[PDB]
Swiss-Prot record, chain A:
One of its GO terms (molecular function) is protein dimerization activity. It comes from Saccharomyces cerevisiae (strain ATCC 204508 / S288c) (Baker's yeast). It comes from the Eukaryota. The gene is RPB3. The keyword Amino-acid biosynthesis does not apply. The keyword Transcription regulation does not apply. One of its GO terms (biological process) is transcription elongation by RNA polymerase II. Present with 10000 molecules/cell in log phase SD medium. Keywords: Acetylation, DNA-directed RNA polymerase, Metal-binding, Nucleus, Transcription, Zinc. This is DNA-directed RNA polymerase II subunit RPB3.
From Swiss-Prot, chain D:
Mg(2+) 2 binds at residues 145, 147. This is DNA-directed RNA polymerase II subunit RPB1. Component of the RNA polymerase II (Pol II) complex consisting of 12 subunits. Interacts with DEF1; the interaction is direct and serves to bridge RPB1 to the Elongin complex in a DNA-damaged dependent manner. Interacts with the Elongin subunit ELA1. Interacts with the Elongin subunit ELC1. Interacts with ASK10. Interacts with ESS1. Interacts with RTT103. Interacts with SHE2. The tandem 7 residues repeats in the C-terminal domain (CTD) can be highly phosphorylated. The phosphorylation activates Pol II. Phosphorylation occurs mainly at residues 'Ser-2' and 'Ser-5' of the heptapeptide repeat. The phosphorylated form of Pol II appears to carry, on average, one phosphate per repeat. The phosphorylation state is believed to result from the balanced action of site-specific CTD kinases and phosphatases, and a 'CTD code' that specifies the position of Pol II within the transcription cycle has been proposed. The C-terminal domain (CTD) serves as a platform for assembly of factors that regulate transcription initiation, elongation, termination and mRNA processing. Mg(2+) 1 binds at residues 145, 147, 149. Belongs to the RNA polymerase beta' chain family. There is a cross-link at residue 359 (Glycyl lysine isopeptide (Lys-Gly) (interchain with G-Cter in ubiquitin)). Residues 474-486 are annotated as: Bridging helix.
UniProtKB/Swiss-Prot annotation, chain E:
It comes from Saccharomyces cerevisiae (strain ATCC 204508 / S288c). The gene is RPB2. Component of the RNA polymerase II (Pol II) complex consisting of 12 subunits. It is found in: Nucleus. The chain holds residues 687 to 833 of 1224 of the full protein. It comes from the Eukaryota. DNA-dependent RNA polymerase catalyzes the transcription of DNA into RNA using the four ribonucleoside triphosphates as substrates. Second largest component of RNA polymerases II which synthesizes mRNA precursors and many functional non-coding RNAs. Proposed to contribute to the polymerase catalytic activity and forms the polymerase active center together with the largest subunit. Pol II is the central component of the basal RNA polymerase II transcription machinery. The binding of ribonucleoside triphosphate to the RNA polymerase II transcribing complex probably involves a two-step mechanism. The initial binding seems to occur at the entry (E) site and involves a magnesium ion coordinated by three conserved aspartate residues of the two largest RNA Pol II subunits. Belongs to the RNA polymerase beta chain family. This is DNA-directed RNA polymerase II subunit RPB2.
From Swiss-Prot, chain F:
It is found in: Nucleus. Keywords: Acetylation, DNA-binding, DNA-directed RNA polymerase, Nucleus, Phosphoprotein, Ribosome biogenesis, Transcription. The keyword Translocase does not apply. Belongs to the eukaryotic RPB8 RNA polymerase subunit family. DNA-dependent RNA polymerases catalyze the transcription. of DNA into RNA using the four ribonucleoside triphosphates as substrates. Common component of RNA polymerases I, II and III which synthesize ribosomal RNA precursors, mRNA precursors and many functional non-coding RNAs, and small RNAs, such as 5S rRNA and tRNAs, respectively. Component of the RNA polymerase I (Pol I), RNA polymerase II (Pol II) and RNA polymerase III (Pol III) complexes. Component of the RNA polymerase I (Pol I) complex consisting of 14 subunits: RPA135, RPA190, RPC40, RPA14, RPB5, RPO26, RPA43, RPB8, RPA12, RPB10, RPC19, RPC10, RPA49 and RPA34. The complex is composed of a horseshoe-shaped core containing ten subunits (RPA135, RPA190, RPB5, RPO26, RPB8, RPB10, RPC10, RPA12, RPC19 and RPC40) where RPA135 and RPA190 form the DNA-binding cleft. This is DNA-directed RNA polymerases I, II, and III subunit RPABC3. It comes from Saccharomyces cerevisiae (strain ATCC 204508 / S288c) (Baker's yeast). The lineage of its organism: Eukaryota, Fungi, Dikarya, Ascomycota, Saccharomycotina. InterPro entries: NA-bd_OB-fold, RPABC3. One of its GO terms (cellular component) is RNA polymerase III complex.
Amino acid sequence: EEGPQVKIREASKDNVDFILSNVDLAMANSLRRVMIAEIPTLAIDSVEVETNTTVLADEFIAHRLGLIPLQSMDIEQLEYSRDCFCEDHCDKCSVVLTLQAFGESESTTNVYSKDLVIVSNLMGRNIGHPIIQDKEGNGVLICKLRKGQELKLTCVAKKGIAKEHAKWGPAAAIEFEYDPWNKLKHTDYWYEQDSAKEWPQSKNCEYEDPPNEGDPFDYKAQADTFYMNVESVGSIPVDQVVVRGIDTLQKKVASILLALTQMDQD
Amino acid sequence: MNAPDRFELFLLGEGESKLKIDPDTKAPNAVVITFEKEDHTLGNLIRAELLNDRKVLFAAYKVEHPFFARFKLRIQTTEGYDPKDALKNACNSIINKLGALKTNFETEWNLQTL
Amino acid sequence: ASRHGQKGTIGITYRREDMPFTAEGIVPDLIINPHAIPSRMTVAHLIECLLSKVAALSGNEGDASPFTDITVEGISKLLREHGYQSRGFEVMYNGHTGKKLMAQIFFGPTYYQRLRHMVDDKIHARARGPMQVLTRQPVEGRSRDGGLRFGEMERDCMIAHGAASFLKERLMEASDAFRVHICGICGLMTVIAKLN
Amino acid sequence: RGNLMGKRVDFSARTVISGDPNLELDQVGVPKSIAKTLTYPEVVTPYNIDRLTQLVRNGPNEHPGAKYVIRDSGDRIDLRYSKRAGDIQLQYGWKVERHIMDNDPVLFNRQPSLHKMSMMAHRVKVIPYSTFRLNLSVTSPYNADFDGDEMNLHVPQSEETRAELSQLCAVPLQIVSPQSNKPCMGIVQDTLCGIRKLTLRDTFIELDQVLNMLYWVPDWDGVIPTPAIIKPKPLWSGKQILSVAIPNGIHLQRFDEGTTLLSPKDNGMLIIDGQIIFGVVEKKTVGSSNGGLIHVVTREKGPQVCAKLFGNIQKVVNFWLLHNGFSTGIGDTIADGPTMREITETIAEAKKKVLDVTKEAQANLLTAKHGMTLRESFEDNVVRFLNEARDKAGRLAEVNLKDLNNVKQMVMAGSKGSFINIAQMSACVGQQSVEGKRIAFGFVDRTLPHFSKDDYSPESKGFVENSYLRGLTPQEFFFHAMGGREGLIDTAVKTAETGYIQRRLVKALEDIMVHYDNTTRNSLGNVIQFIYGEDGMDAAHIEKQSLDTIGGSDAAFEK
Amino acid sequence: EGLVEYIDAEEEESILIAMQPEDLEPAEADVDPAKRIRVSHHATTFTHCEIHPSMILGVAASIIPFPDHNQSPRNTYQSAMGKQAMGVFLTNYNVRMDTMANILYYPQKPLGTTRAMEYLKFRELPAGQNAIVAIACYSGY
Amino acid sequence: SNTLFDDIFQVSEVDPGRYNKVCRIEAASTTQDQCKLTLDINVELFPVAAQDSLTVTIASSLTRSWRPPQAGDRSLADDYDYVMYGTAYKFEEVSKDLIAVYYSFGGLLMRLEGNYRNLNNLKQENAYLLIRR
Amino acid sequence: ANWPLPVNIRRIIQNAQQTFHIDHTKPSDLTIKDIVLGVKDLQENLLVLRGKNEIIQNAQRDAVTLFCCLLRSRLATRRVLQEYRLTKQAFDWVLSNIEAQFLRSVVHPGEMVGVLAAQSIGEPATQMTLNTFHFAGVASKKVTSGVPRLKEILNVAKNMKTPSLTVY
Amino acid sequence: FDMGGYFIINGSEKVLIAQERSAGNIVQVFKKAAPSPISHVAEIRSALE
Amino acid sequence: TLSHLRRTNTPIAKPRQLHNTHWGLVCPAETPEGQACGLVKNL
Amino acid sequence: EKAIPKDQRATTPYMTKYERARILGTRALQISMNAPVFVDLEGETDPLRIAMKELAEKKIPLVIRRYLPDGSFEDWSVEELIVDL
Amino acid sequence: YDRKVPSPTGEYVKEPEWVLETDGVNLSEVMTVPGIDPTRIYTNSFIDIMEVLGIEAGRAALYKEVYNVIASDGSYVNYRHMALLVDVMTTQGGLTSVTRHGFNRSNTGALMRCSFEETVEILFEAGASAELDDCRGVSENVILGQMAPIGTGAFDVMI
Amino acid sequence: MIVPVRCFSCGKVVGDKWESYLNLLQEDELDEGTALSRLGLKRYCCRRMILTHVDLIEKFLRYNP
DNA sequence: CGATCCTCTCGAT
RNA sequence: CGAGAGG
Ligand SMILES: [Mg+2]
Ligand SMILES: [Mg+2]
Ligand SMILES: [Zn+2]
Ligand SMILES: [Zn+2]
Ligand SMILES: [Zn+2]
């Protein structure tokens, strides 16, 4: 195109390795921040408990349920309940999951995020299905039942961002590095004898040219060219973590422009 | 127990406006916009972009206390240039930068495999 | 607290974004200060930390047992073979700006303890309430919506300042204050004042 | 004592304390719940009516609200219950028991209260979260820290009572103690550490940062100072932007060791019209020093101005540091391979010097120095050599510490750590003592059952050859443990001992005060001093000044 | 079998103890600089030998990683604090009816451990977690 | 306004006294045998070696507020390599008639020795140090 | 030489040679009489005591003795002209400033010095280190110090631990 | 994991604290301080086991 | 709990101090700060 | 009586810090209870700030009774006292 | 002992001297010895200085001794504070201890004395001696819940 | 006391990897280091999550209630 | 006859 | 009342 540039080194179902050229440091960082916190996802945020004759306490279980990853593909077509006109929740603003489990076997019975069942009318949107990546296809060990042990619960999953609770976090950790050779002197390597021998060289060093001692420091040089890697939890596919990241940022910049337009009258 | 609600970080309060544009007393053609329910995500980005404009004499943001989600933005420009127009342009450029990044990332992603 | 007489209470909580980060996306769970180190001379803290990093990476047990041949130098060797600088430092970036920090940070796991004594179990405030039977002074203890003791050491502080009107109300209005009828002849509270 | 000199009181609160880089010196962070508990009885006036009516409307649960409305005929109206808590029409003269609000003066305290400074008036800042928050530079007077200390708060109820607080106990009024005729509060920890780092000659900051720093100073005149470096890249120096925090007409001069007017070492201090000419800003300047920047700012610009200063200096330094970062690792205890040979070869000679005196003493060729036992002299010598040892080895370590050494950095700022610390962690722990003697023979003719009888060797009587970094041998371990215990015991002894001493001293002098004749007297009216302190001067307003007519040659005097 | 013996402080007075079976008595005739300086045998006439010098500590101090690298009082302080730390005091807490019980949601065994911890069931009933800790001057908070 | 002093100096010593970006240079005039100079310089932005012959200039030349270069239509009082701004803080009489001024460039110090500084270097908040080649 | 005294004369001077921007090149407009009598009259205004009687007036003259030594030393004709190059206008201000500062420097009647003094000894004592001492290097040079000595002193110990006589 | 070594007294679990004392039937000599007339003393607290 | 079950009360020449003889019998670290420092011991 | 005449008064013509503190408190207490103000509050609502203004403007009609240890006293008006501090 | 003393030329000079330190005291007899400067002889026992050279020398030594305890620590306290304690102790013509034996047995106020120590006993001898309480002390007003003649209340306000 | 869902530090879902971790150790007779690696727990914050986990739930389940 | 202040909790009669 | 405990 023309502005910031991309070079996707590695691409998987849960990881993007890329090079962000023609960008100011602020933008890369801001987009890193927004990926971490401001992207909407759907997570459990209400547990009605009918029976819990388990080892574990109601809220301990409830806590795990929020952390359980849920399909947030079509999340933009589900309202925040706070905006929904319904009294409480509904099919437009929420997804209802049910969990019934009883220790049938003598052997310890296990409870999985697969054992959760949607009851809500999904209205054809790719939403609320618990994220399974488990080879054996179970995904997340919620609880363990013994024998007479029963756990009957209902749960409403709502739209939210990691800023309100980390359970709505769509990404894991985000690798971020600029200037692998310290040509900018943006850091001061602590040493005993030799910085070069003592500090491990970066993977990204082969992506930039080495300094060359017979050259002075570059003063007009600026922070531009970033080696980022975005990891998904599985709520949203990797590309979307970065595309929705880019979007959500521009979305909230646009609101500022909009606010100036609004206060410009009365 | 004395902890505020987590939506207080992004949901606007009662009355509460997003931006408040106060005139700077200590300098001519300067202004202080208070952004309510915002952090270093917007703060840095806007300030950084303002510095790219050759008409912006001064630009800086600060978050007086971590507890509260709000930052102050001081902007001083040259004669015959409204800081509101400077902030407007700044935001506009930022969107166009992201607009490009969006299509660029997409273009690469579709050329990728796995 | 760490297992090294390094007790402290939380000051603030930052969310992942605002937190300092390693180029691999790692963020601290906790941030302790360089200052609470040289005075205390708790080297075992730093060793345990160095050791813990290697345990985590190697997928092994940290041998923090006393009289051993385990050395900072030997641990360092191991950690370096793992691809990190041997003395546990790491280049970190400012979560606000994204810029590298001029300093490298001693970063790694360390077994920390969640102790009793929690704010909300201690917070207490009283603006008038239950009074003792005998003395007619505020009751004792948080548990009973008690008053706080303005002891004699605090009495001394006020006298030092020369806050005489303030000292009086601390001892009369807040607390004890009462009215008696005295005889102008014998000067005793032996007056049967039939008010009304 | 329990019900009359001291007593349980109303309008009091307590909690865990926390520091706040973003709070004013004279401010105290009051948790929302506490502020909703404690009240002020405010008489209804036309100046306040509309505020008070709105507060009554907010009631007991919304923060700037109130509980209880008192009327003529002193009958209370409980706002959380009253069927008319909504209705309510305020009359002038009536009382509204409003919640404790922002800027109300309050008495903050930390026990043991053994100073006027352990109780000071503070401005209120109602805040989220359950801790009382306070400026780091008010830590020292209270002797507080954030490892779990709780602090007390008393709320004045009288108009004349809140005047007494703000006009006599206010934290700014309290900056310069009459105790030491110097400030009792200075720049500490991070801000002390950072100020050094920021202030170095090497430290240069660019436009981007400069502006955010400039904007961070509240007292800022909105004027960008001209960068020291104009040429390739306009660069500002740490000193330059920090001089923005410093007020005008602030003059400060020092001269440390090296110090020439060209200060090649960048030591001493020269501040003119409140701009730093040369010299690194560390403890000697920005601490609670006698001839410090604080002692000057208070005495020249005022307690209020000086109080705002702490704030700005912190605001800038804290910001710069947040973006620079500072840390401490195990590599900071690691001293050079060659230094390590030099250290062991040092302990080696100490070990021989002792063996030698041991061999000498044993041959009955030891001469006892008058007034002391032949054995006393031996022990005195051995001890000296071993102390000489630790010290040399430590100095060896200290020397080999690179300037980039984080420990060395705190030692330089004066923020944390002493030589002794560098010495023990890196070089050698040293001789252990109990009852002021080296480890004694607890067992018959031996310190431990792992030794032979009659063993006066460094090792036998408690000399720890090893550093904390190296580790301590079992024998060394136990001997250190014995010496450590002694400290712990006598700490517990002091706290109680000094506690009583203080009380008796107070009680003994309590009734003494200056009368309207500058005569210092007691409750009976007996003269202790005819002029207070022999000069009738207030201790806070005094400062060390050299008397020029006392020294130098009679020749130099006349000249 | 007479290989091990019980000795009290009074009898302890008449014996000579070796600290290690190895380093304390094999033979006589380079050195790792990193390792701590250990004094020469200079005693031969042993009657006994320690089981393990680390056994001089008891239950609380036995939880400390490297106490031989800490200043002696810090060791006393942590000996007091481990006692205030939360964890899983017993497996049957769900069944007991006691005033005040504090249980950690996700107890983790320490990454760095003492040999003694084994006999103390610390990695079986831990009281603490393995936080990722940064030593840094961050926000000043 | 206007230049206050100009001279070509030969570098005699270069000192990185426990500093990485700064160096203390010792100089003396090529024309004046009694003229001396001592200076702290940023060696990252302007590297200086032994026997270097630098051309030093002081001027009050080209209050208010610093506005960014904006070289769009800006022509500053230099064709020079290295430029600094400081304050005159001390004026010394080095016996007979020899004078010696002291300048601080935000901590980077200066000391010039001579005599002809007569109708020149005043106790001004002004002074821009200029160095070329 | 260095002793704690009210009024920093050094600062007042620096301030005057700033407030008045004096050029150390132009000769001062001061008289010997201006300096000599000026500095003499200033001494008469450094009131600590007020009463119109010799008994009190002597105590007054006594209370300021040391301060006036400093004043006279610092404001001697030679210095005021050669050292500080004070103009009549600048000098006059210095004199006013000293007088003003000196008066603010006086102790306030009502000042509860009893408690003050007690805490001022107490607090530092609480801070004191070691029950024994730091002296413990020499086998018998030891003298009771710190808290236990402070205890001996205050209790007026009839039988002290280390009685010593120092013979000149 | 419970170790025992304690008692249950009205549902409340009581620990007996091990009490340090000097052993009897022990002969000890003590130098008496300067003010006293007796220079030294041989002590024995004879008890029936 | 393990620590509590192994405590040592000492009532009332230098009983607070860590005596040589305590080697291998009493823990050199485990004792309360202040109050009953070194009077309360742990095996 | 006993007293001391206006002339022969030997105390500081200056107001003590405590003197100020009590005066300010006393007057702020009066203003707070709707007492008439002897100055024009330029948008001032706070009783203490008002008493502070009244002090600068020297519009407070309170006279200080300064007691001596023999019992005798000196009377000094707020008007006459110098307010340095 | 390294001693600073004026040079003929005026400058203060380090002219070292021989000094004798003692284990024990008998001031009375050691000063009357030849070869010793009796005008300079000192003792850490200020109570002996008192007995031999009077109460004013006592005051001086008692100060020197308090001062040293502060200074030994490395600390500094303004003269006036220790001067006042030293004065309080000394003003009775003797050495009034800061113990219930010294200052508390003093001719002060019954209520203010019992606030310290020997509470009941003080009050009984007060009743038996038929003592009059001035109500001028802090404690007395503190006890009576009255504004004490402390700073702010050390004067009276009128119209 | 169950494998936490998600790594406290980074947020990576670790709750699905427990059984699998125990199988790699027992069945595949692997060492912790390689086992953790095989489960793709690359950063030490994630390795500690599983490596340090004490699965008390099993002991609790042992009681009948 | 006194022997740091203050704080918290529990338990038992 | 006593025991434990916090700074
Ligand atoms: Mg400490
Ligand atoms: Mg503390
Ligand atoms: Zn809905
Ligand atoms: Zn009667
Ligand atoms: Zn992780």
